[PDB]
C-alpha cells in the first residue's frame, strides 16, 4: 500500500484486465481403396495350395 | 382420323447358338481358386 502523509487526499491505484484464448479443432480424413488387387491375393491364414 | 390396328402377340425367343459343341462338355465346375487343375493320368492298362 502507498504511504501517504495524512494531510493529503490519498493515492489512486490502477487495475488490470483479463484475456481470452480461442481455438479451432483440426480435421483428419484417411481412407483406403480396396479394389480387387488387394482382395484377391492369398492372405496369411489361407492354406497353401488351394486356400 | 386414322386407321386402327391390331397386332399378333408374338412372344419373343432368341434362337441362340445351339449347344452342339457343349454336348462334349458335360462336366461343370464353379471355383474361386486361383486356377483350375487337371491330371493327365493314362487310362489304358493294355498289358498282358
UniProtKB/TrEMBL annotation, chain B:
It comes from the Viruses. It is found in: Virion; Host cytoplasm. Homomultimer. Assembles to form an icosahedral capsid. The assembly is primed by the interaction between capsid assembly protease and portal dodecamer, and major capsid proteins assemble cooperatively to form the procapsid with the help of capsid scaffolding protein. Major capsid protein forms hexons and pentons of the icosahedron. Viral genomic DNA is packaged into the procapsid through the portal vertex. The packaging triggers a dramatic reconfiguration of the capsid shell. Belongs to the lambda phage major capsid protein family. This is Major capsid protein. It comes from Chivirus chi. The gene is 17. The chain holds residues 4 to 51 of 354 of the full protein.
